[PDB]
Amino acid sequence: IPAGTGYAYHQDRMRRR
Amino acid sequence: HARSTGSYSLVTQQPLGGKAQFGGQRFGEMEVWALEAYGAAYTLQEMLTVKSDDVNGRTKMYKNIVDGNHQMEPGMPESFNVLLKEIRSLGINIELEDE
Amino acid sequence: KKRWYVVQAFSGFEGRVATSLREHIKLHNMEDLFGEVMVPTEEKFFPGYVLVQMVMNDASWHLVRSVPRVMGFIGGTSDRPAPISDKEVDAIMNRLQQTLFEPGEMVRVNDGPFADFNGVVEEVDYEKSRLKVSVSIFGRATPVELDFSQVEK
Amino acid sequence: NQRIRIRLKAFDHRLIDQATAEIVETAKRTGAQVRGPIPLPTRKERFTVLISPHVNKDARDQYEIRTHLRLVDIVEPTEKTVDALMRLDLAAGVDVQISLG
Amino acid sequence: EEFDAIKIALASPDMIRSWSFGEVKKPETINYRTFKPERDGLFCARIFGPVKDYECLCGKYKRLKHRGVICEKCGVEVTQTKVRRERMGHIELASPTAHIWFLKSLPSRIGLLLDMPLRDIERVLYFESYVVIEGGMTNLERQQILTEEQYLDALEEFGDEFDAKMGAEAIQALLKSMDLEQECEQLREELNETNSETKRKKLTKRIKLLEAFVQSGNKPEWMILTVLPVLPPDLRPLVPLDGGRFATSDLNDLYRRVINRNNRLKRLLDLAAPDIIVRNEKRMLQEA
DNA sequence: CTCTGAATCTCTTCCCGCGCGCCGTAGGAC
DNA sequence: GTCCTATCGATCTTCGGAAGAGATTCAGAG
Ligand SMILES: [Mg+2]
Ligand SMILES: [Zn+2]
């Protein structure tokens, strides 16, 4: 999900891009 | 009643439901909302892909748990693919996309 | 002049539809309103449609629908069902008056204890009006001969 | 329904009778009526060959290939009986020809 | 397959043929005594996939050593049986058929595109009245539905300078004649012609639908089904129950009805049945 | 003569689990 | 008995939902 730890993962993916 | 592993339904590979059948508890929509209320995303992903739906994944999870690795390979919930066929059986062309 | 009219009928009960119309015409003594009722059949041209030589009176319109296993006629509107045509009757009467088992082809049987089994043509019993098709019995998948009626193509 | 005839041919008496017993017993068990076995006359070829590679015309060997024939007639077949017969496999080297009607 | 987006759009008939691995013809699934799947049925082994785990139906091969090969005793391809739940088939309808959803949504998309009332389009589709297309040198409008008595008038008043079809055929011809972009431009300039908000709002809806169809790769005739794909059988199992019987399956019976009706229509069209009979068969097929 | 009002049409919707327990193609032709 | 085809192709499928929303008609309305 794009929330919580899932939001952390998505945010890392978007920042490393 | 408690279930570790047993019968799996045919049309969708989710575990059976009931006591007279070796079935597991249903994780309703309210429970999903409650999990989303916390930041638990790995818990939800496991609960709705490995434990219940992804046929290939739930065996690879079994080996790791026996091996003591405690790592999951989610893949994709098989039931979802079934949905696609039900829509692809109509005059609708719905498909996954790369980008 | 009694134009033909086409009537819907219970498939499988079509002969009973024709008979039940034949009785009701005489019982209601409307013999002067019906000429013939056609159910063409070959060794059935129209699977579930009955042709009736008739005129168009409201009494006849309700009489046909008063026969069992009859919804009604097929036409443009329910108020006035329509005849078929001039030449259509003639064509239907014209018809009412008027495949090789290739070696190697994979067949299925039509009757017998071996009916509907995956066989494969093995030889040609042609001038006998017969057949011979290999099948998979007791590992000794045996050279097995069949009647010509036992093909399924 | 026409009866089905099974003609078994083999070079061995005991093997052919074992296969025949299997077939008839299966047919009886699966509720078919079977009129068999019938021991049809057994062919016996013969061959006489010189055993001496050169001359010695009187030294010979006579050999024989005995071919045994058994007939099993199954009258009034049933789908159940036919399926049982199909799933029953017979000893190899025993030829079976099925005539139908 | 890894993915990042989901796209939904209309499916062209050739796309449906691309989906399919075979054409289901015989409306039979399995024997009532033996449990083998009947070929060219709703459960055809060579169309959707083998039933055995890694063995062909014909039994010619029972090993991974022959995986991926094609048998010639039954025609079934030997592979993983799981594929049987993913392969689809298709039924080529003997005549066009309108997609029910697009016919009777909250508005009528098919009706909205042609600006034709839902009642009248349903009347046309269910073979109740004619509709004149390509009317040419006749006092017959672009669509201008007309009844059989009205059609009986046009049959002799005019010759072949007009065309009036019935059912989904007329709607498909109208859709195939839709000059979509020119129509949208004309309507978007006609919007400024009048201040009738009661009609301006639905005109805005119509032009929005036209713009959505123009921008998307969708084409109008795709609202009319011509090939109907069949669901993979493993998603609609005919599971047995206690004793030698199979549990009833809802989708299987609907497909059986459709296949039987379409085969009857094909048989008649081969035998040149009268217009009344073929019209009734086409209506029954559409309703099935 | 239609327009821009209402009024009268059809369609969609209605908590979560959990257990029992039955009950589950039909008539007609060779 | 088996196995077949077809499915109110001569009835009336229920009246003890409410509402809420559109969509579709009409109606004085100028
Ligand atoms: Mg001899
Ligand atoms: Zn095979």
Side-chain angles (χ1 to χ4, degrees), chain C residues 61 65 73 75-81, chain E residues 148:
Chain C
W61 182 99
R65 289 167 65 96
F73 326 90
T77 177
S78 62
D79 301 323
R80 295 171 174 266
Chain E
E148 66 282 333

Side-chain angles (χ1 to χ4, degrees), chain E residues 182-226:
Chain E
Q182 180 268 169
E183 160 90 353
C184 183
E185 298 151 350
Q186 175 181 356
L187 199 57
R188 283 189 171 185
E189 275 185 337
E190 188 175 352
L191 167 60
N192 309 129
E193 184 177 2
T194 49
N195 310 330
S196 307
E197 179 192 340
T198 63
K199 230 291 104 189
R200 278 188 155 188
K201 231 305 179 180
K202 192 52 66 180
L203 196 151
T204 304
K205 281 293 300 185
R206 194 169 187 261
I207 65 181
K208 171 179 270 186
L209 179 61
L210 264 119
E211 189 74 14
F213 246 98
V214 161
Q215 296 170 144
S216 62
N218 299 312
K219 304 182 190 306
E221 336 87 300
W222 302 357
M223 279 179 172
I224 299 294
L225 291 180
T226 304

Side-chain angles (χ1 to χ4, degrees), chain B residues 37-89:
Chain B
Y38 319 102
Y42 292 96
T43 299
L44 255 180
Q45 186 187 28
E46 166 187 343
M47 202 83 59
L48 70 93
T49 61
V50 164
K51 285 178 170 177
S52 176
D53 219 309
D54 189 294
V55 200
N56 296 32
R58 58 192 183 190
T59 54
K60 272 71 177 182
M61 165 103 284
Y62 199 2
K63 271 60 191 178
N64 299 331
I65 294 296
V66 176
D67 195 20
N69 186 27
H70 292 46
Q71 182 175 318
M72 59 178 176
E73 295 76 13
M76 171 169 52
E78 171 67 25
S79 60
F80 167 62
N81 288 328
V82 177
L83 162 69
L84 283 190
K85 299 310 168 187
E86 289 183 340
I87 303 185
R88 200 157 298 187
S89 169

Side-chain angles (χ1 to χ4, degrees), chain E residues 55-61 71 73-76 78:
Chain E
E55 168 218 340
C56 61
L57 185 62
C58 68
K60 263 174 164 49
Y61 319 101
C71 79
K73 190 192 170 195
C74 186
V76 59
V78 45

